[PDB]
Structures are given as C-alpha cells and as structure tokens.
Design a protein around this ligand. Structure first.
Ligand SMILES: CCCCCCCCCCCC(=O)O
Ligand SMILES: CCCCCCCCCCCC(=O)O
Lengths: 250, 177, 269, 25, 250, 269, 177, 25
C-alpha cells in the first residue's frame, strides 16, 4: 500500500497505492547507440530535468466527465526540462506519472487513468475539418470535457469522452497502460512509462507521444459537505536526452 | 499565539479548495522562528554551522481526515516562492497523510562555502514552504480543521564551530541571592 | 571526532518509505539526505571536538565580583568580605551548566584583583583570600584569628603580582552536583538546590596594616570546569534569571518576555 | 610524554589530578 | 601558428596564433568529491553548454583606450549556459577565451589581453562611494573606456584603464594570465582558464570570477582606407556544473 | 633554497637564436647569461629562504591603534571600545597581503598597551580585551553582562605585565581569505570584500572600578601571519589607499600621483 | 606621457638616417624608471640584490617594416655613452627585426661585491642604451613610425635579501572604514 | 626534536597547531 518514489530532489509518498504499473513492461532507459540516428552527443541534464513537476490541479465534481493532457506538451513550461525542449531540435524522455486524489471512507467514486500512445484525437465536426495545433497543445492546463460552445469550432477536437475522443469505445481503453483510482481503495495511481515511438528521438514541439486521459467511470458521491475534491498530477521526466542545440524556439 | 502552546501548531482548513501556501520559514538554524529550538539554541553558542537539517511533520487530525501536502525547500539566491509552481521547482516531498501521521524531509546542505555563519546578515540558506497539494477532506460530522506540528533536528551531517556567547539570553541586572 | 560522509544516492521507486514514520513513539527520525534526494558523494572532513563538553564548559567565565571598600576609620573591625560560593549569580555561566541535570568536574579558579585609587597613591596593597568550608569559623573582622589559616587554604596577592590561580577537586558529598533539585530540607523547607549546594564561603581581607590611602579593591572570580562529565540534558533557560537556586522567572510589573520574535503573517519567512 | 594534536609535549607537574589541564577527548 | 579548437558543436581555427595560454598551468576539470561542499548531484549539460558563444564585436579605432567584460556575466544570455546559470543557486565553470582581430601587413597595433581573477574595480569618484551592481554586470556588451559623463556617477567604476581600473599600474598587468595581439605577428589570442575561487562552487549572479581586459598598448595605425577593425570575442564554458535547482531567477 | 650556478660559456656561431622569441605568447623569456655572453664559471651560494612567503608575511606589523579615553563622569556608561577586525586600515600590512588574491594563514596577535598619565598618578590599571565573533552580543557599556566572557575568549592586561600575545587559527568559512572580491550582497549591494570578510569585533574595557585618575589608554595591535599560503599574485598597489575594503583611489581636489618619477629627456638615464 | 599608456612605449622614426640614441635607463633594479615594475617593486621590500636581469623588447611596427637596433649594456665606472661607438664597446646585442618581433638580452651581474644595495646612492650598476644600428625602413604607404615595448624580469640568478619596508608606497592619513 | 639551521632545539608546547611558530620551508 505504501510507495515512496524519489526522482531528482523530489520524493513522492502514497500510503494507499494499487502498486505502480510499468507501461509495456519496459523500464525507461537512455537511447542506445545501436538504435541511434542523429550523430551528435545528446545532452543529459539529469537531476535538473528528471524530477517531479506538479501541474495545476483540477476539480472533480459530480458533473465531471473527463480530462486529458498530452506529453511532452504539459511540461513545456517546466523548468530546465521545458528549456531543453525548445533549445533543441530533438528530445527523448520516459516519465513517472503520479495522479493523486484523496477523499474519505464516506466518499465513493472511480477514475480510470490511462496513458495512450499516439492518441490522435478526432475533430468535433463533420466535413473536411482537422484539429488545430493550439487545441492539442493546452499546456499544463490540459483539456476538460465541457459540452458547450468554443471557437473556430472547425478546429476543435471532439468532446465524446466515452468514445475515447477518437472513435473507439471507452471500456476498451483498458488495452492501454492504465490504473483505476477507486476511492474506497486507493488515493493515487502511478504509471512509469518508457519512450515509445517509431523513431529514436523526435521533435517535442511537433509530436506528442503520450496522452494522459482521466475519466470518472463512477461519479463522485458523498454526504459530506466536502463534495468536490481535486485531482493533482505530478509528472517526472526520466532519462531525458536532447540533441541538435541551437536558439530557443518561440 | 505568542505566549502559549498555539505558537507550535498550524491549522489546516477543509474549506480551502486551492493550492494555497500554509506557512514558510527561513532555513537558517539560528534565525527566527528556529532560533529557540534545541538545535537553534545550541547553534547560537557557535559562530559557524554546516550540515543537513531534518524537518518532521505530524498530522493531528481525525483518523478519518485526509490530505496531501507539498513540503518544499527553495535553495538560496531567489525570493521565497509565492506560488505552488515556483515552490515545487525546488527540492520537495509530496506527503500523503493516511495511516502514518508523520513524515521527515531533509534540507540538504547546499552552500557555496563549507560553513555558514549562525548569525546571518543579508543572507539565507533558503526557505521551507508548505502548500496544499490536494485538499483537507473529511467525512460528515468531523471537525473541519486539523492541526499540524513541525519538528527540527540535525542529521549525521551537522556540525558547529567557534564557540561564542549566545545572543538568545540576557542579564539586565543582578541575580538575587 | 569525525562527522560521517555524504554517500552517493540514486532514484528509488520502492515499497519502503524511510521518510514516513510515527513521532508519537518519542523517537527522532533516522532519515539522512540520501533517503529523500538524489545525493552527490561529498567527503566531509569535520571534527566535533569543539562541541565536546570539555570544550564547551572548559572556558573561564566570571562567577562573582567581590568589592572591598577599604575604610580607614574602623580598620580592623571591617575590611573583609564573605561570599557563599555558587554558580548561580552570573547568567552566562549559569545557563551553560543548567543545560544538564547533573554535572561533575574539577574547578580552576582564576582571580583578577583590581585596585581603584581614591587617594594620591596606592602604597603597597596585599590581599588574602581564604576558602572556608562549611563549619569552619567564618572571620568577623579584618584581624580575626581565623585568618591564621592554620589548616584552611589561603592564597595571597600583592600589587604587582600576576593573576592568582588554583584548582579545586570535585567537592560534593554526592557523586555529582545537582544543577536542579526537586526536593526540600529535612524540615520541609527551602525547595531547590539551596539544600544540595553548600560549598562553604570565600572570604577575603586586605592584609596590609592601617595606612593612609583610600582604595577600593574589586576582585573578579573566574571559573573554568576541567575533566567534565554531565547527565540528563535539559532545555535551555528561556527567560532572565531572578534568583539564585530557584527557577523563578516572574518579575514585578513586567510581562513574560522570551527570545521568540513575532511576525505579522506566517506565510512570509 | 608526547601527544598528537588537531605533535606536542606534555607532562603533569602536580601531585593531585584536579591540577591537570583539560581532558583528552 | 595554426590552431583548431573544437568545443561542442563549435570549432575555432586561427592560422596566426602565439600558441594558447593555460591560466596558472591548470586545465579545467569537474569538481572533485574531495573538495565538494554542496551535497546534491550537479547537473552537467555537456555539449549544450560547453560550446563557443560569440559576443557582440567592438570596434578598434585610433582613439580606443580599452574594454572589459566579466565572467560569467558576459554569458548570462547565452543559450543553455545562461539558462542553467539562473535556474540554479550554484554554478562552476572554466573557459576557453578566443579573442580575434585580423588586419593586414600594412597595419600596426598591439593589444594586451588579460584575464584577471577577482578584479575588484575602483569607483570613479572620491568619498564614500562604491560600484553599483548594474555597472559591473553589462552583459555581452562589456564596458568601453569612454571618458565622458555617465549617470548616478557615484555608482560608476573608474575609467583609469592605465591603472588597471583598480589602482595598480598597467604594465604590471602581465602578472595575470595574458597574451598580446601584435598585429605584425598574430590575429588572435587564446586563453584557457580553470575555475578559480576560494569556495568549490559559487553564485554566478552575485560573484564574477574573471574579468577579461583588453587594452591597446600601441595604437592602431595604417595608411589603408580600412582604418578601424573589429575585435571579436568567443568564449566557451568548459566543465560547466550546476547545483541547487529551483525557479529561474529574474 | 639554492640559486643555480652560472656555468662557463663559449663563442657560438649557430642557427638557433635563444635570444629571439615572441612575447605575444604571454610567456616570459628563458634566456640566461650563458646564452647572450661568453660567461665565466661562478659558484653562486645564495639561499632564497628570506624571500619565502613565510618570511615575507611572517613579521609583526601594526593593524590597529585603539584609543580608550577614560571618562570619570559616566564611568560605567562608557569606557569601552569596539572595532570590527580587518587588515585594511594600515597601509604597510595591507599592501603586502594584497600582492595575492587569496591568502590562508594562522594569526599571531601581540598587544602593546600604553597608559598616558593625565593626573598625578596612574594607580592600578587593568584592561580586558574580548573577541566577539559575529552574532555574539556586543558590549554596550563598561559594565555590560557580556564582559562575563562565559564562552568568548578574553585576555587581561594589568600595568606592569609583559605584552599580551595569543594565536588565532585560520578563521574563514571558506578555504582562504579573499584579498579581493568581485562580488556583492545577496541584495546586490556592498561591492567588495566587505561581504566576505566579517571576522567579528575586538572589544575592550578598563576593568578597574571607578577611581580618581584621568588616563588615556592606547593599545596598538600587531599582527603576524604564521604557516602561510597564498594564490594568484597581483601587481602591487600603486596609489595611496582611501577606504577599507574598496580599491578606490580618487582623492578630492588632488591629482593622481604614482611613484613614477619623470625625467626631461629619455636619452639620459 | 606620464599618466597614460604612452609611458610604456618608445617611438622609432624612419626619417632618422643616423646612429642616434633612442633611449637609456640605469640598470639598478629599484632606480627609476625600473622601480615600479614587478621586479622593482619586490626589490624595494629588500635591501640587497644580486643576479642578472633579462630585458626583452617587442617591435610593434607593420609586418613590412624593418630595422636593426643596437642594445648595449655599459658596465659601471664610466659615464653613460653618448655615441654608438662608445656604447658598442660594451656588452651588446645587434637585433634584426624581421619575422620575430621579440628579443631578449641579459645584463650580467658585474659588480665588485656579491650584492648591491637596492637603494643606491652615488652608485650605479650601469646603463642600457638603445641605438639605430641601421634605419627603420618602410615600403610606400606604411606608417612612418613604429613603437617598441621593453620588459624586464630576473634570471635564475636573481636574489634579494634583508627584508625592509618599501619606499614606493605611502600613508599620509587615516584609511576610512 | 632537534633541527639544523641556516643545530637547534625545538618542540611544540601547545595542543593547537595555530600556536606553533613559523613553518619550516
Ligand atoms: C573558592 C572558589 C569558588 C569554587 C566554585 C565551584 C563550586 C561549584 C558548585 C556547583 C553547585 C551550584 O551552585 O549550583
Ligand atoms: C582579535 C584580533 C584580530 C585578528 C585579525 C585576523 C583576521 C584577518 C582577516 C583578513 C580579511 C581582510 O580584512 O581583508
């Protein structure tokens, strides 16, 4: 039940885990010379970039339908990791995602926490439309399912969370690395994920590798006055490597 | 809360649903409020110090009350953090208050020089700040606030040198026989 | 005395949380830097000798300032001083020893006699300091027969002489000195260390016979502990002392004032 | 006798131990 | 006469050197655990920070009296090195300084290039005055001897370049690591410098370790129409290490 | 430490010109007498010990002159002095140490107390000199409780006593003293060594109680470095010093004056 | 040229077609102008000196400018030379300024006594004089003058004794705290 | 112990090295 994960100068503790999941059974590791493409020495900032970064908390209420964040986008503003991300053409990283949500023994609810590779979102409308860059790059704020009028909507992604935002049934989302946070049992979910791509390193600004999706499968219910509780996400890059240094991209 | 037992605890609130700062303190062993603790008092009999400090916290709410807190140490050279984002960019621990009511965090020695003065001028070793990581949640019919206790002691690391008289005690007059 | 080295540390992902404990147990945490952060290997090189009790208490500090105002009128009738020895009258020394419940050590006493000239010249001044253990006759005048010092220890100082100094062995009838005493008289009186700490008196007289120069002689007494041992540490005194042998701290028409400084808001360091 | 230091010479000159200097740690 | 120094993804060549000087005979190296004070792992960005950064060129004309720059200040805005400098409390670095100045066999002039440790500048005025922080932190622009009215002058450093700006005679400046660029012989000066301080790492914002001083000891003279020539400086950090990460200092 | 011998030399006619070099390189020439002239064989016999740092800096020089003018009116209120210790206030010593960027050494302090009689007699005068490290309470009067010296080091001198002397170990929190510092406060203030060189104060008081003789006591403090090490030599100071901890040299309404002496014509030595 | 960088260089002239004297200086380490150099400054903290001095010169003209100079050292006991003939009768070096811009010449220790005083009275160790051996020649369109730099340091030979306070620095007043 | 000189007797009498005389070269 007790976890303690130490990353840089950061340590996470959780007295109520469903022990951690290692996506696809592979622990993150630095890129091997046998798989490498680019020929310059990759810079490895170590503890200055491989540490836990806590994002802006979201509120879980009885009418919440879901949220998603994309990596590495969510960390583009995070200290040294964010800096390296934009000073270099190529980057590569694994992550430890720790989703935290505590309540009480008098609260009930269940979240599905999934990490999806190449989560190519569907657009909201019909016709010849596609999702605009800005909308799949919300930053640490992430995206929350709101079912109610946004803009240049021919550029917006779909809000059909029950179709995994991409035309497949929620429900089968379990085929992806995931954990459930069932309030009567745990107060956190931890997923360790390696780098997954069809190329050894890639552009972090242009390609998001993982999408983190959180969906309340069973609603938050309680008789307590504290009837909304936050969900906080802390993500730690792991084995971050960068290559192709030049000016910082704006 | 000054001349009572209340100066030793902080009250957490379930009504706060935000990443608010709960408290902060300088990390200098002989600075206030650390000055009158055991380690601060002994440090005030010396001129230089070095080593790591261990800070421990004890949650004193109900067995059914929960919360996750962010305890962070900000190395010097910058102003103390005013937002959780800035605080967490430093050394920190995320504390899940569940069945164990206590946690220990270590403020490592990070200094240019090997020792620092116990009487700091325009100087600091940094800060420790506490923030709501999630929220203080309680079931029905439970007190809506809970207290937190903070302890300090030195690690195996700790060392003091150059004995001197303390600035933490006075004699302004004769002591009657 | 060496401080341990800071060892290298790595990123851990485990079931054992060294940072998590219960202070309810009355035990201090065992977490070191390596348990909470990815630590760098540093070769620390600090001795802890100066923090030893011998070093801390083994420093000379003032414990008494004895003022003898020489009167020329009743030269033999007065001109002597008596002081019941104790370490309770000067704050700096008192506070250091009271950091422990029981202490045991030998004492080094150094005297700093200063003659204040109140006439044109000071002539030749000689002083006698005699240690009078409890029970020995205490001098009643400058010419008391007790100054013969047939068996008590006396030390003489004359103008021009270096600072006198001598050692005293651990003096108690018990195995250690009581820095605190939660007890009384056999008569249910005198709560405190007044019962336990009766070391006799230090008496002094100007030895030189009647002369014509008014002078005042202030002899400050310095005490240094040697070969020290101490037991049962205590929190340091937080307020000014008011009396010897008593932990009383209340002062008339004055509020309790500790060394804690207040701040407006606790969210600003 | 001779002792190392944080080498120097040292012997006791008096017959009572209370007379001795500071203790060795 | 031919040099080629390769640093990160940067290479310097000079077909007319007076071969390089290694300040104090010590080659730069990472901080040893035996001398270390701080106890956290130092981040070492490697090729992303240890590369040549070229500063803004200055013009050498017949009326030039001198210039100076301070390290690490001059590089505070330089890519990943500049970033690390402000995200960390402590830093440590050595440098390769390559001063370049070409002319023609029909030009004559001589520069003294000196690297001074703890170059504590004197203030311009008499009385109880001291040098203001801004004036000893000019950035890549450096400071040029101009003998003519500046501001809050009670905060300005002295312009007495012939007194080394600190009350000692130019002329004895040779006691410091230095090289001469005598136009009839060379077109560059190269000084490799280790970290020099009385502490193992230090605050880069508050303490400048080296001061680079350039002074025309013999004036630029020529009958050519090209009668002013630039002096360009390229500095490469070496073995840069940082420790004590937190938010970026502004 | 031996100087090398001058070897015999002969007439050379060669392709290698040892006299010819390039100083652009920043390297000093290696030409010795034998390379430029037909040299005679001389057996030099000079030690270089006196030119060592230990020898050069290991000499006692004045660093402070502390004047205490004893006032009889407010005897306990005043009559004490305070001085923030440093090696910047006296030119001869300052210039020698500033020939290096960083220095490290132990210090020997010798005191030369001189009583100036302003009355018919001087009576018996005793002084107390206390070292107050940064943070320890600084005395506010002659009778301040801080003079108890419970743990600070004090030294006493009385008329008739030889010159006091004691050693201090290397005091910095760094590995060496900064003779120069190109840096600031954590507040972007106080450029210079004022930041780095905070060694506390030396305080003194006349210990003798109120008396009737006016006197002034001037105690000059001498400092000698022992077990010396130094790094990064610098050119010697070329102008008069004006302030402590600052390299400032400008004086009001006065031109810059170095030790260089001019001559009319450079073709006459 | 006194309070500037010009006191450190001598200007050679192409218009001079004669065996003229360019400059001269006494050889005594602590005499002027040598007094304020590194070696002159350290020598002023001692009373006696011995050893050989190395003097180096750097020609700073154009790469197309040429000249040959006569650098000569005149042992003591005679007036400094006023003609090239008298100068060359002593110890000297003929310097061809071509591709190497620098040359070093050594003034050997030639003294009756093994040591000399750093403060000389009516005494000298000799002189160093510089003369045109040929002429400063330049092609068309080249600056007609060129500068020369002179350096000094001691040889393996060099030694100082009897430490004393320097006459090259003063304190005429208090140094403000 | 005994040392040669540019022979003499010398030993340290105090327990702290700062107390020692000038260093041997
Ligand atoms: C004769 C000179 C004075 C000797 C003083 C040493 C006695 C210490 C006794 C400690 C007990 C106490 O007062 O609390
Ligand atoms: C208590 C007597 C005085 C001891 C003086 C030694 C301290 C030297 C500190 C050197 C730093 C400086 O002032 O530049």
């Amino acid at each position: 039940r007790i976890i303690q994960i130490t990353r840089g100068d950061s340590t996470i503790t959780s007295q109520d885990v469903a022990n951690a999941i290692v996506a696809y059974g592979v622990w993150p590791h630095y890129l091997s010379s046998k798989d490498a493409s680019a020929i310059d020495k990759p810079s490895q900032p170590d503890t200055s970039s491989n540490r836990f970064y806590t994002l802006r908390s979201v509120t879980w209420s009885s009418s919440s339908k879901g949220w998603w964040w994309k990596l590495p986008d969510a960390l583009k503003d995070m200290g040294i990791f964010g800096e390296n991300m934009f000073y270099h053409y190529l980057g590569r990283s694994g992550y430890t995602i720790h989703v935290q949500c505590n309540a009480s023994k008098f609260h009930q609810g269940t979240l599905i926490v999934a990490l999806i590779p190449e989560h190519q979102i569907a657009s909201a409308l019909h016709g010849n439309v596609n999702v605009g860059y800005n909308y799949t790059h919300p930053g640490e704020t992430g995206r929350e399912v709101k079912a109610e009028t946004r803009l240049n909507p021919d550029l917006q992604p779909t809000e059909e969370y029950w179709l995994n935002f991409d035309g497949t049934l929620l429900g089968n989302i379990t085929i992806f690395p995931h954990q459930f946070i069932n309030l009567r049992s745990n107060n956190s979910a931890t997923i360790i994920a390696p780098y997954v791509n069809a190329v050894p390193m890639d552009s972090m600004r242009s390609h998001n590798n993982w999408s983190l999706v959180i969906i309340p499968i069973c609603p938050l219910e309680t008789s307590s006055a504290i009837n909304t509780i936050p969900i906080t996400i802390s993500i730690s890059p792991m084995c971050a490597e960068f290559s192709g240094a030049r000016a910082k991209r704006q | 809360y000054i001349n009572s037992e209340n100066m030793y605890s902080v009250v957490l609130q379930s009504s706060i649903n935000a990443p608010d700062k709960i408290f902060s303190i300088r990390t200098d062993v002989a600075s206030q409020p650390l000055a009158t603790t055991l380690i601060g008092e002994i440090s005030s009999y010396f001129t230089h110090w070095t080593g790591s400090l261990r800070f421990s916290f004890m949650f004193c709410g109900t067995a059914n009350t929960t919360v996750k807190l962010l305890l962070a140490y900000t190395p010097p050279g910058i102003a103390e953090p005013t937002t959780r984002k800035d605080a967490m960019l430093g050394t920190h621990v995320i504390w899940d208050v569940g069945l164990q009511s206590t946690i220990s965090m270590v403020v490592p020695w990070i200094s240019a020089s090997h020792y620092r003065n116990t009487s700091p001028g325009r100087s600091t070793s940094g800060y420790i700040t506490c923030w709501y990581q999630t929220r203080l949640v309680i079931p029905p019919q439970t007190p809506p606030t809970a207290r937190l206790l903070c302890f300090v002691s030195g690690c195996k690391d700790f060392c003091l040198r150059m004995a001197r008289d303390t600035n933490l005690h006075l004699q302004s007059g004769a002591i009657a026989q | 005395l060496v401080v341990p080295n800071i060892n290298s540390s790595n990123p851990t992902t485990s079931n054992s949380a060294p940072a998590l404990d219960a202070a309810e147990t009355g035990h201090t945490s065992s977490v070191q830097p390596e348990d909470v952060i990815e630590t760098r290997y540093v070769q620390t090189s600090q001795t802890r000798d100066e923090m030893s009790l011998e070093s801390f208490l083994g420093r000379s500090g003032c414990i008494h300032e004895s003022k003898l105002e020489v009167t020329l009128a009743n030269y033999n009738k007065e001109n002597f001083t008596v002081w019941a020895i104790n370490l309770q009258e000067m704050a700096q020394i008192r506070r250091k020893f009271e950091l422990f419940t029981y202490t045991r050590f030998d004492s080094e006493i150094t005297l700093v006699p200063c003659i204040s000239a109140l006439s044109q010249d000071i002539g030749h001044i000689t002083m006698q300091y005699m240690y009078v253990p409890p029970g020995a006759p205490v001098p009643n005048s400058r010419d008391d027969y007790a100054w013969q010092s047939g068996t008590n220890a006396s030390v003489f100082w004359q103008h021009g002489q270096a600072y006198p100094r001598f050692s005293l062995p651990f003096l108690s009838v018990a195995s250690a000195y009581y820095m605190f005493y939660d007890g009384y008289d056999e008569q249910d009186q005198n709560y405190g260390t007044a019962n336990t700490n009766n070391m006799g008196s230090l008496c002094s007289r100007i030895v030189t016979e009647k002369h014509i120069h008014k002078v005042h002689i202030m002899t400050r007494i310095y005490h240094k502990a040697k070969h020290v041992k101490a037991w049962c540490p205590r929190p340091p005194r937080a307020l000014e002392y008011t009396r010897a042998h008593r932990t009383n701290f209340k002062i008339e028409d004055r509020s309790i004032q500790t060394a804690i400084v207040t701040r407006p808001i606790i969210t600003t360091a | 006798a001779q002792v190392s230091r944080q080498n120097y010479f040292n012997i006791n000159y008096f017959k009572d131990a209370a007379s001795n200097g500071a203790s060795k740690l």
